[PDB]
């Protein structure tokens, strides 16, 4: 007998980017200066996701 | 067995072409370079922190 069966394999997912200064802070300008004291956390995060 | 000379010559010519294509600075070893680069950027971030 001849039988045709199926196999389902994932290949990829959804690509995502985030803006740190809009997620953490928003439109504020005191938050931006207070967040500058933590080094490059957001350059690091943008590299990881990219 | 009847075409041994042509096969030996094709083998030798392909070996010389592998050598000449590696000499001419074409980057086909970008994966080991990527390994080196990722380790160095990790340590630069840790020291800059």
């Amino acid at each position: 007998s001849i039988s045709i069966t199926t196999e389902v394999m994932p290949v990829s997912m959804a690509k995502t980017s985030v803006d740190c200064n809009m997620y953490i802070c928003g439109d504020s300008t005191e938050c931006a200066n207070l967040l500058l004291q933590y080094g490059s956390f957001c350059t690091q995060l943008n590299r990881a996701l990219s | 067995y009847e075409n041994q000379k042509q096969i030996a010559n094709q083998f030798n010519k392909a070996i010389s072409q592998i050598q000449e294509s590696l000499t001419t600075t074409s980057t086909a070893l970008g994966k080991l370079q990527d390994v080196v680069n990722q380790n160095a950027q990790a340590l630069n971030t840790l020291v800059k922190q």
Partner: protein, 49 residues
């Protein structure tokens, strides 16, 4: 005017070269990856408002 520069100190300790990180997109791309020579490709640099 208040700008950001990336200054280059040489072996003897003197400033030999600099880029202005506000002149072009290319000077910003130079300052963000911290080099003077960039390879080919696409690179994210900053965000716009």
């Amino acid at each position: 005017k208040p700008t950001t520069f990336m200054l280059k100190y040489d072996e003897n300790g003197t400033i030999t070269d600099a880029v202005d990180c506000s002149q072009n997109p290319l000077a910003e791309l130079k300052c963000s990856v911290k080099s003077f020579e960039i390879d080919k490709g696409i690179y994210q640099t900053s965000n716009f408002r």
